[PDB]
Design a binder for this molecule. Sequence first.
Ligand SMILES: CCCCCCCCCCCCCCCC(=O)OC[C@@H](COP(=O)(O)O[C@H]1[C@H](O)[C@@H](OP(=O)(O)O)[C@H](OP(=O)(O)O)[C@@H](OP(=O)(O)O)[C@H]1O)OC(=O)CCCCCCCCCCCCCCC
Lengths: 244, 12
Amino acid sequence: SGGPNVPELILQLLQLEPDEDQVRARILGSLQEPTKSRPDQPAAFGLLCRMADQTFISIVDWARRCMVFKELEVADQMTLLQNCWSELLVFDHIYRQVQHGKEGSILLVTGQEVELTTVATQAGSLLHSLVLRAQELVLQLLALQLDRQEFVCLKFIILFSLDLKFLNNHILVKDAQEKANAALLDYTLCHYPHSGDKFQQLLLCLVEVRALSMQAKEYLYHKHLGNEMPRNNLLIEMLQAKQT
Amino acid sequence: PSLLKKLLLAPA
Ligand SMILES: CCCCCCCCCCCCCCCC(=O)OC[C@@H](COP(=O)(O)O[C@H]1[C@H](O)[C@@H](OP(=O)(O)O)[C@H](OP(=O)(O)O)[C@@H](OP(=O)(O)O)[C@H]1O)OC(=O)CCCCCCCCCCCCCCC
């Protein structure tokens, strides 16, 4: 629901969440910049790549001003991001469909709608599958009645969903994971008016988000091998980072 | 060296 008693971590995360209007304008403005369009590709492909890059830019900004994360060193900060970047982008996309959702189309961060019929006839089987799978998560999260409080908590959980051995500051990150889960559990137990373990049901979704994110990287990798990606693409840099 | 590092080291 709303919350007379909302976990402090969640309340703070709500205030750290960027404004969708200014994010949209900033990205729209970024896409307006003139570019060297290659003649062997639809111009839309390059723009969509840049759009996703700028989306990740805004996501990195969000992480930077997060509690605990801001108290970390650049070494650990990069490690966390290099591990959860695709997951955060996918989850961003998914929640966008939850907020503003017609079942016949998907909404992009720029504000433009693409009907599923377009994707079915214009996209390859891989991307088509990714979009359809993502919509299944959206449908499930709507059924579970995902709200803003849970979304920001889930994002935070995603950010720190890593094995402690790959980081330098164990205690600080370990504490964050425990607090994040506790917050999610506390909120769901206090707010879910239905039956079913919402805390566990949401964590199951994260498992699917992560698997969905894996396939997205495979899509990016395929385009990368075919020299289809624009040079100095941020996502490809993230994809080419050493895996932890 | 990397865009990600230059992004985290940004002043704003
Ligand atoms: C890390 C994930 C971050 C994602 C967050 C942001 C999500 C935004 C999603 C953007 C969706 C855009 C929908 C636009 C509508 C649409 O369907 O556009 C089509 C498609 C283009 O079609 P394809 O990308 O599928 O490429 C096809 C394909 O490669 C064909 O190969 P196959 O036939 O073997 O299948 C190829 O055919 P050929 O092998 O015969 O050559 C075909 O080449 P050709 O043209 O010459 O025939 C090629 O096109 O629109 C695109 O340009 C969108 C690319 C956006 C890039 C943004 C980066 C996001 C990467 C992850 C995907 C998002 C997954 C969704 C999240 C769960």
